[PDB]
Structure 1
Amino acid sequence: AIGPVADLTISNGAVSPDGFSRQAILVNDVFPSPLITGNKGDRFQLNVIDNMTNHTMLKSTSIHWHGFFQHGTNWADGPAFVNQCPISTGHAFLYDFQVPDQAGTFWYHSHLSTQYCDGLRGPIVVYDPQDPHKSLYDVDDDSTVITLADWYHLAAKVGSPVPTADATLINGLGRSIDTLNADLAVITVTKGKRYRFRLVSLSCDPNHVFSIDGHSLTVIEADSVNLKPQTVDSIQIFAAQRYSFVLNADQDVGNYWIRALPNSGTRNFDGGVNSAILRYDGAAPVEPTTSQTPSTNPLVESALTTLEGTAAPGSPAPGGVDLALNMAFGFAGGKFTINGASFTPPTVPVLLQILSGAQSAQDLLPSGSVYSLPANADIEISLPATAAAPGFPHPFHLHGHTFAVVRSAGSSTYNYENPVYRDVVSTGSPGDNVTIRFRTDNPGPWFLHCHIDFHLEAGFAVVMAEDIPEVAATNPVPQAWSDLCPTYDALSPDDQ
């Protein structure tokens, strides 16, 4: 792997991850994007060199490090027009940040329009040399990162505004129904060894039920939060989520199917679609012939807790916080709506507006999309599921924070005692009332949006304008960030 200090060169090229080929987005010349690593505490310096020439997939770029708090470096967060102007083609831009206090499974992806779907997305791992789950396994390396990704034969701006994947990719590889021949990913295990697998959903849209024939999975991490271990059978993982699970390779030397059933496009697994291969050392070089059992024991979010059993911020009762907010989902034009307002990217990034002297949610553009948050306060946000917003279950994501999930989709219980904490949550479906809490530690504007990229493009986002008065003092910006906008605004519309 690469990093924490590395060049990330972005370019256009042809790729063929399901055996069909198309023009996509390459990172340091490879698809899928390379794994980046570091250790708890490291300074990351990722110098992102944009050499893209293809306007249809967007010449400009901007990169988000999904999961990292970025305290003091809000400018390096990534979302285009919230946290920077995009990097311009033929230019470089250095994201220089630290991760004290975090370690786990993370990923990076374009945060400009819907460009991550065209291929600028990869996993990050920050190891803890003192990992409390460490003695549960033998292997934890580049080979144990397992990515899921939806793949489309038409590019995001060429096909439907809300399309359907032709393939699912597992470690970059998988099959579409027209390509029952295409290569399969192979994950290699030695019998009697214990493995930490790090599961990252690189998905622009579908969730996936993930499961490995013949095996059970001991989940120990959610979106970079250490968990009390929780044994399961199958994991329904939503776009942008991550889980670490320990697998003990203690079954008959053989080939077993690894399955990621999407919630749309090609359901079930005929011909090894939505599939990859677990292969014990010494097993024949052949496709698995195993069967899934319906099996029980799925991951249930309301049953997970943090390894440390941390309480929700606030007091144990609905509204027991400094500010309680309710996000009412809706869909007016062909556009998603939160409390009546649809996110359109402002000309001047939200952070620059604040830095240029805007003082309140009311001065911030776009009007109706920005929420002012006070400093050092317990905040509660409820996001009641509704079919009024099509393409639910919507996985909502809060930048700059991990939050307690006080009420998970599919449950009615509220847990203030020891909830799971994570950064991406399924807002479930009619009658759910997913409710989340966090503390306002971290000054700056933080995107809070649906992680279905096509929903984001159609305006399904708000901005948590956190502790506005301390943003400028807390996030001094580097010269290069200040120059992003003047450079980007000078471009012709088809060099964008």
Structure 2
Amino acid sequence: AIGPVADLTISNGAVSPDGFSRQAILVNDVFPSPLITGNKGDRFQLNVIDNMTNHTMLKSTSIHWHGFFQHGTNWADGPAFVNQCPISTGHAFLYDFQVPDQAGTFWYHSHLSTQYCDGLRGPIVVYDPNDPHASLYDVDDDSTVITLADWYHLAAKVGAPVPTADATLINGLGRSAATLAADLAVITVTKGKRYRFRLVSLSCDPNYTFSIDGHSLTVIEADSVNLKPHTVDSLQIFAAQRYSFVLNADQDVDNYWIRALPNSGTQNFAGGTNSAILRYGAAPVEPTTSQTPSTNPLVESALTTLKGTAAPGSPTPGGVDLALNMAFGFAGGNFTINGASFTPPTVPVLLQILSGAQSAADLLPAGSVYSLPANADIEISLPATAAAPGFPHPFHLHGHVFAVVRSAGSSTYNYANPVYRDVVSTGAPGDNVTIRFRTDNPGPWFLHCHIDFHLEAGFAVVMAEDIPDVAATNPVPQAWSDLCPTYDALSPDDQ
């Protein structure tokens, strides 16, 4: 309902999404963060005005626009100390970028420390006037956006380092163990109408097993990539993933439970926890519908792109220009990738390159940056392992969509017609989730676990793609150049 040109004023305030009051982060004075929309190929101009006064949740901020390639605008990607210095409080900063060739469901979130868990996170929809699936549904609007999110009664820097959620929020509303009377979200449908629901995980940690009582879900989009329609009776959605599904409201007029079962914390539905309501003329009361066992769950390896696009490269292991393997580990309270743990450098990686850094060995942090050649095929394997606790780890690559040639829970490789997405579960020990992309987007791009508490503990690397062309391809506005001198002048209590 706002965008693609809009102010986003960030501030602190009290919120009670699950009937429990706590300080949090507001965007345009609301929680949860408001929906942003625009059309395929639009210019987005999002002026982030930072008015936060709470140091415990960080006064500074930085917003990542999740899913957007940001070609030519790497300075706008969001990750703190990779792509920019944070916006300092009392200041504003204009994100100004274009989305050529992209349409689907996205989201925006703080990409500073674990700040987005404290409430700076909202959905984005990029509509396609010529959406190949337009004819599959009648309704696609603000009312068909469904968000899932974990919620904590103690703030990110106040609770335990890897906390347990007190509530699942659906559209920013949910119940906790001790607030069984808190208002539930209601999604309204009219009988006989078909709905494009856009489901987005704003989660800081858990994945949700999502289903709707009595209804099947026709999945048509994954992480902004159009699919061949695939009908399931449930799906598992990892932090930061998006699915569009078509729901045919063809059941009896009634109330039906919408269910989102987390993989940790409260793993039931007692008292309407982990739930929202699908309401057709039906009475304004809770559903009393029953969960049927899932017999046709979403299986990632059975998803394919609408076009049937082959994976980049030739159909054999290591059949690409560069193949990398990321060996996960954990030691000293810190995650490692190939022995190195990510620590935010004081000079953002993008500025280091603009400043004359020529190679990965030059780039800080040492051991955490990988140089990638321009205009090439890349293959990255992310073998899951017990040495990295809190699996399954959903990994996200910035600036790119990738082919998932091998999915979690599958022993097979698909090079011919694999799903493409931008967040992938690396699964359980024994898995070897394997991705391929093309280096068509010069810049440093974060590659990290989207469990935010893991990223904070260093579960991340930086892909420095086509270093020689970074500066020329990504001219920076003066307001971006001013970020670091402003931030570095702040005393630590104001950060």
TM-score w.r.t. the length of structure 2 is 1.00
| 1:220 matched residue in structure 2 | 220
3-state SS of the aligned residue for 2:492? Answer: coil
Offset from partner CA, 1:388-419 (integer Å, 9 cap, x none) = 00000000000000000000000011000000
> Take 2:44 and 2:307, find their aligned partners in 1: how far apart are those partners?
27
CA RMSD of aligned residues (A): 0.3
Q: CA deviation at 1:464?
A: 0.2
Deviations 1:131-186 (A, max 9, x none): 00100000000000000000000000000000000000000000000000000000
- Mapped to 1, the partners of 2:313 and 2:366 lie a distance apart of 29
- SS state at 1:330 partner: strand
Shift of the alpha carbon at 1:295?
2.3
Distance (whole Å) between structure 1 residues aligned to residue 462 and residue 208 of structure 2: 28
SS at match of 1:430: coil
| Alignment correspondent of 1:395 | 394
What secondary structure is seen at the aligned counterpart in 2 of 1:309? coil
Separation of aligned partners in 2, 1:35 and 1:220:
21
For 1:134 and 1:387, the matched residues in 2 are separated by 43
Q: After the TM superposition, which segments of 4 or more aligned residues of structure 1 sit over 2 Å from their partners?
A: none
Cα offsets for 1:1-35 (capped at 9, x unmatched) = 10000000000000000000100000000000000
The whole-number CA distance in structure 1 between the counterparts of 2:302 and 2:431 is 16
CA distance in 2, matches of 1:74, 1:458: 24
Question: Once the two structures are superposed, what CA deviation does each residue of 1:461-488 show, in whole Å capped at 9, x if it has no partner?
Answer: 0000000000000000000000000000
Deviation at 1:195, TM superposition (A): 0.2
| C-alpha separation in 2, matches of 1:294 and 1:386 | 30
Rounded to whole Å, the distance in 2 between the matches of 1:484 and 1:210 is: 40
Question: Secondary structure at 1:494's aligned position in 2?
Answer: helix
CA deviation vs aligned residue, 1:33-84 (integer Å, no higher than 9, x gap): 0000000010000000000000000000000000000000000000000000
Per the alignment, residue 424 of structure 1 pairs with 423
Give, in whole Å, the separation in 1 of the partners of 2:61 and 2:235: 32
Q: What secondary structure, in the 3-state scheme, does the structure 2 residue paired with 1:295 have?
A: coil
Following superposition of structure 1 onto structure 2, how do residues 46-125 of structure 1 map, counting pairs within 5 Å? 46-125=46-125
SS at structure 1 position matched to 2:482:
helix
Tell me the SS of whatever aligns to 2:316.
coil
Counterpart CA distance in 2 for 1:159 and 1:428 is 26
Offset of residue 87 of structure 1: 0.2
Residues 269-308 of structure 1: CA distance to partner in whole angstroms, max 9, x if unpaired?
000000000000x000110000001121000000000001
**Consecutive unaligned residues in structure 2, runs of 5 or more:** none
Offset, 1:446 = 0.1
1:367-392 deviations in Å (ceiling 9; x for gaps): 00000000001000000000100000
Between the aligned partners of 1:293 and 1:106, the Cα distance in structure 2 is 30
Post-superposition Cα deviations, 1:79-131, rounded to whole Å, max 9, x if no partner, equal 00000000000000000000010000000000000000000000000000000
Q: Is 2:327 the partner of 1:328?
A: yes
Q: Which secondary structure does the structure 1 equivalent of 2:308 belong to?
A: coil
Shift in Å, 1:332: 1.1
Aligned residues: 495
TM-score with structure 1 setting the length: 1.00
Q: How does 1:205-216 map to 2 (within 5 A)?
A: 205-216=205-216
| 1:168-218 deviations in Å (ceiling 9; x for gaps) | 000000000000000000000000000000000000000000000000000
Offset of residue 357 of structure 1: 0.4
Distance in 1 (alpha carbons) for counterparts of 2:466 and 2:394: 25
Task: Measure the CA separation in 2 of the matches of 1:440 and 1:275.
Answer: 41
- Give CA deviations for 1:219-274 in whole Å, capped at 9, x if unaligned: 00000000000000111000000000000000000000000000000001000000
Render the CA deviation track for 1:416-455: whole Å, top value 9, x for unaligned.
0000000000000011100000000000000000000000
Classify the secondary structure of the residue corresponding to 1:230.
strand
Say yes or no: does 1:274 pair with 2:259. no
How far, CA to CA, are the matches of 1:438 and 1:77 in structure 2?
Answer: 18
Distance 1:361 1:175 in 2: 47
CA distance in 1 between partners of 2:268 and 2:3 (Å): 38
CA distance in 1, matches of 2:421, 2:262: 22
Match in the other structure for 1:240: 240
- 1:287-333 deviation per Cα after TM superposition (whole angstroms, max 9, x unaligned): 00000011210000000000010000010000000000000000011
SS at match of 1:259: strand
Q: Determine the C-alpha separation between the residues in 1 that align with 2:252 and 2:294.
A: 19
Superposed CA deviations along residues 335-394 of structure 1, whole A, max 9, x for unmatched, are: 000000000000000000000000000000000000000000100000000010000000
| SS of match in other structure, 2:469 | helix
Secondary structure of 1:437's match?
A: strand
SS at match of 2:75: helix
SS of match in other structure, 1:396: strand
